[PDB]
Amino acid sequence: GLVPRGSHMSGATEACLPAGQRKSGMNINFYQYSLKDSSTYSNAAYMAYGYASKTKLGSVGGQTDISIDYNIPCVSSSGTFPCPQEDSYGNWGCKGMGACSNSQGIAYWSTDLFGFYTTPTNVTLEMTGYFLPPQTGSYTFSFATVDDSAILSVGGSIAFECCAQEQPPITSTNFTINGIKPWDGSLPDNITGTVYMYAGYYYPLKVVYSNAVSWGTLPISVELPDGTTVSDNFEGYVYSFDDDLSQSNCTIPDPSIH
Ligand SMILES: OC[C@H]1O[C@@H](O)[C@@H](O)[C@@H](O)[C@@H]1O
Ligand SMILES: OC[C@H]1O[C@H](O)[C@@H](O)[C@@H](O)[C@@H]1O
Ligand SMILES: [Ca+2]
Ligand SMILES: [Ca+2]
Ligand SMILES: [Cl-]
Ligand code: NA
Ligand code: NA
């Protein structure tokens, strides 16, 4: 045939072609989350959108290194140093530091998350931007682990609306990766999700992440169509655009036929 037939049953992921000035990296918004609240983040509506009904603490833009690896302090005999969780032991010490005099269960303030001074022990944050595939094909996004709760969403009308990156969150719960902390706190069923993408279109991307206490972890990766993996540093793949609600042609409801 002259033209491709298109993905079946309108199944292509919606993408975007924003016409404005592209910015490298994602925007990170931070919102209040209560220390040791082990229920709010179990919820889908909260992780999709309800987080933004909490106080907004601040934001930072232009972030290309997006994994989280927050370690609480150990107030040790030799000073205060961050403790990798796997090195913690007893009640409690940190291997190579001896016993720690401080509590695991209080809030701690740090710039570890994106340079923004907040409480990484207890916070929710929303990463938004557009993923630019260099290759047409299947992309597999993954979280290596999740501590405490996270989702990843890809696509127009799923992550956010085309050319409307800065708007309040949309209500879609059609997550690409559902990493929500289960009520009965095992691991989530699946912390990887696949999207078929067409090169050169901008795909809305949203990550929402919550920590309730102590350590926080979210190692983010994507496997490209060519089989290579990009981990943590997404420079060259993620971008931001200021809203332009007036750009009529911004949404591409089916890239395969566009
Ligand atoms: O923790 C989130 C991000 O914080 C930034 O300031 C850098 O340290 C990144 O390497 C890290 O991925
Ligand atoms: O699961 C509740 C909790 O368990 C541990 O205390 C640590 O792994 C925390 O980071 C985690 O939030
Ligand atoms: Ca829409
Ligand atoms: Ca935690
Ligand atoms: Cl030790
Ligand atoms: Na860690
Ligand atoms: Na520290």
UniProtKB/Swiss-Prot annotation:
Annotated glycan sites: N122, N174, N190, N249
Originating organism: Saccharomyces cerevisiae (strain ATCC 204508 / S288c)
Residues of the whole record sequence present: 23 to 271 of 1075
Region (Sugar recognition): 184-227
Encoding gene, per UniProt annotation: FLO5
Protein name (Swiss-Prot/TrEMBL): Flocculation protein FLO5
Cellular localisation: Secreted, Cell wall; Membrane
Similarity field: Belongs to the flocculin family.
Applied relevance: For many industrial applications in which the yeast S.cerevisiae is used, e.g. beer, wine and alcohol production, appropriate flocculation behavior is one of the most important characteristics of a good production strain. The ability of yeast cells to flocculate is of considerable importance, as it provides an effective, environment-friendly, simple and cost-free way to separate yeast cells from the fermentation product at the end of fermentation.
Domain of life: Eukaryota
Organism taxonomic ancestry: Eukaryota, Fungi, Dikarya, Ascomycota, Saccharomycotina
Function: Cell wall protein that participates directly in adhesive cell-cell interactions during yeast flocculation, a reversible, asexual and Ca(2+)-dependent process in which cells adhere to form aggregates (flocs) consisting of thousands of cells. The lectin-like protein sticks out of the cell wall of flocculent cells and selectively binds mannose residues in the cell walls of adjacent cells. Activity is inhibited by mannose, but not by glucose, maltose, sucrose or galactose.
Post-translational modification: Extensively O-glycosylated. The GPI-anchor is attached to the protein in the endoplasmic reticulum and serves to target the protein to the cell surface. There, the glucosamine-inositol phospholipid moiety is cleaved off and the GPI-modified mannoprotein is covalently attached via its lipidless GPI glycan remnant to the 1,6-beta-glucan of the outer cell wall layer.
PA14 domain segment(s): 61-236
